[PDB]
Backbone:
C-alpha cells in the first residue's frame, strides 16, 4: 500500500443490491442435466441464463429449507452477474455454462452423487457461479506485465483465481446475499475451504500438475467417494473440465465459444498499444480451426480422456471432442 503502482484494470466488487431478473423456464429437467445444453442459445432468449440456471440447480439439488434462503441466493446470483464484465468469453454466460456443466457432470457420475453432502453441492454450485467474477478479459501474465495492483496483492500462482475467490466471499458476506448465514461456524468453514479449493484449481497453470496427479489417482484405483478429500478432488476435476469444456458439448456449440480468440486479439492489441511484447498465439491466426487442434490435443482432450477413465460413464464429451477435431482436421 506504500509502493506506487498504476490504477488496476480490475474493477472493485459491486456490493449493491440489484433486482434479480425473471427466471424463465430454460428447458426440461432432462435438458438441464444434458451435456448438450447450449448456454449461448438460451442467453439468446431469456433475461438471464445465469440466474435461470442457478435457480434450477438450487432447486434440483434441494438447496433451501426456507423461502428466505432461496431469496438470498436469488439476490446473490443477481449481484454476481452484476460483477461479471461484458467480456467476449469470461462473462456471465461463461459462468452459467460452467455452472450447468458442473451440474451436468456431477449428476452423470452416480457414485459421486450418492456420496456428496448437501453442503458440498452448495459449495460446488457457488464456486462454478463465481469462479470468474470480475475477470478483466486479460490473463494473469498480462496483469503482471503491466504491474497491476491485484498482482501485488495476490502473490504466487493464480492471481485472478485468488481474486475471484476473495470477491465471491465479499459478496456472500452481504446480508441480503448470504444464503449460508444459517450455517454453523464449522460448516461455513468447510464451505469456504471447499470453495477456495475449487476456484483455485481453475488456474490454467496447474494443468500438467493436475493431469499427472489425477493419473496417479487412477492407477491407485480412482476416487473413493466415502472419503471427503477424494470427493473434493473429484469435484475439482469436474469443475475444471466444465470450465474448459464448452468445445466438447457439440460441433455447433464449440463454434460459438471461439469468442475466446476475440479476448486474445484484444489483449494482443492492448499489449501493442502499451508498447509491450505481444503474447505468442494471441493475434488472429491464418486459420482458426487448425490452430484449435494443438490446443485440443494439449489441454482439452487429455482432460476429458482422463475424466472418462476416472468416471467410465462420462463418454459423450470425449467423443464430441474427437468429432470436433476430425472436422477441424478436414477443413481444407
Ligand atoms: C496462448 C495460446 C494457447 C491457445 N491456443 N488456442 C487455440 C487456445 C484456445 O483456444 N484457448 C486457450 C485458452 C487460454 C486461457 S488463458 O488462461 O487465458 N491463457 C492461458 O493460461 O494459457 C495457458 C496455456 C497458460 C483460457 C481459456 C482458453 O481456452 C478457452 C477454454 N488457449 C489457447
Ligand atoms: Mg478463470
Ligand atoms: Zn472460467
Residues:
Amino acid at each position: 500500500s506504500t509502493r506506487r503502482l498504476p490504477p488496476s484494470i480490475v474493477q472493485d466488487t459491486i456490493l449493491a443490491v440489484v433486482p434479480p431478473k425473471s427466471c424463465a423456464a430454460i428447458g426440461t429437467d432432462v435438458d438441464l442435466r444434458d451435456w448438450g445444453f447450449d448456454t449461448f442459445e438460451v442467453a439468446s432468449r431469456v433475461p438471464s441464463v445465469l440466474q435461470s440456471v442457478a435457480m434450477h440447480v438450487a432447486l434440483a439439488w434441494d438447496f433451501f429449507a426456507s423461502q428466505e434462503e432461496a431469496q438470498k441466493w436469488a439476490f446473490l446470483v443477481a449481484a454476481v452477474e452484476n460483477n461479471y464484465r461484458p467480456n467476449p468469453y469470461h462473462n456471465a454466460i461463461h459462468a452459467a455454462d460452467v455452472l450447468q456443466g458442473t451440474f451436468s457432470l456431477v449428476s452423470a457420475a452416480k457414485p459421486l452423487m450418492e456420496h456428496l453432502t448437501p453442503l458440498e453441492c452448495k459449495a460446488a454450485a457457488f464456486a462454478a457461479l463465481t469462479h470468474d467474477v470480475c475477470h478483466p478479459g486479460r490473463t494473469n501474465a498480462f496483469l503482471a506485465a503491466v504491474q497491476d495492483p491485484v498482482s501485488f496483492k495476490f502473490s504466487g500462482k493464480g492471481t485472478l483465481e485468488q481474486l475471484h475467490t476473495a470477491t465471491a466471499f465479499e459478496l456472500l458476506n452481504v446480508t441480503e446475499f448470504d444464503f449460508t448465514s444459517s450455517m454453523d461456524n464449522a460448516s461455513f468453514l468447510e464451505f469456504k475451504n471447499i470453495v477456495s479449493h475449487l476456484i483455485g484449481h481453475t488456474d490454467m497453470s496447474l494443468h500438467s500438475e493436475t493431469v499427472a496427479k489425477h493419473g496417479a489417482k487412477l492407477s491407485a484405483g480412482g476416487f473413493d467417494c466415502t472419503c471427503k478429500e477424494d470427493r473434493l478432488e473429484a469435484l475439482s476435476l469436474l469443475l475444471h473440465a466444465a470450465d474448459i469444456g464448452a468445445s466438447s458439448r457439440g460441433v455447433a456449440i464449440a463454434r460459438k465459444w471461439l469468442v475466446i480468440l476475440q479476448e486474445f486479439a484484444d489483449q494482443a492489441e492492448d499489449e501493442r498499444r502499451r508498447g509491450l511484447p505481444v503474447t505468442p498465439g494471441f493475434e488472429t491466426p491464418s486459420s482458426v480451426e487448425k490452430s484449435q487442434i494443438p490446443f485440443l490435443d494439449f489441454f482439452v482432450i487429455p482432460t476429458f480422456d482422463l475424466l472418462h477413465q476416472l468416471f467410465p460413464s462420462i463418454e459423450e464429451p470425449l467423443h464430441n471432442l474427437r468429432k470436433l477435431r476430425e472436422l477441424y482436421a478436414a477443413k481444407a
